[PDB]
Amino acid sequence: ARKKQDPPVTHDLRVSLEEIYSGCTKKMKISHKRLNPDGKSIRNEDKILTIEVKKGWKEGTKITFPKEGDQTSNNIPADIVFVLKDKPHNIFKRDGSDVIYPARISLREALCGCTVNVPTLDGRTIPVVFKDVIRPGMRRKVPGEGLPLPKTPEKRGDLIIEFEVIFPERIPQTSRTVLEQVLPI
């Protein structure tokens, strides 16, 4: 008098950085076949599956709702596995519990000093002053301005400023004669 289990069904759960920052609730409606009273008849049912997305959850976190798949007179319904996926964010890049802020600056700003207003996921803004030379690819850590660590959400990763230094398309001879005399060896 034995049954047997269908393989799990997977479904992506796309979640923005801000939602990873703070947590959120996601409601998934699943329409599935269920076995009636009589063990022979099958209805369509809807059921809401509620997923409390925890602060700082990393891509690939699995949230399994056991036996929520289609039922037969005979089977064990499949597990429904939700897999957490990052939504691309238009400004930040996610690096575990770190957040990368690409900051584009001219070669002027890179060599002469500049100031970078770092936005934070919760709305604040943190001005960071660079007096010294900034190199291509340079990183500058803004401590604790990242995401909660998911196992211990009191705790925070960092926001990293990562510079791309934009060079001009051309430099006219007149500039180059001037540049030559002032650029270090």
Partner: peptide, 8 residues
Amino acid sequence: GPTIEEVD
């Protein structure tokens, strides 16, 4: 198979 969609 079952159909799943997000709801508000």
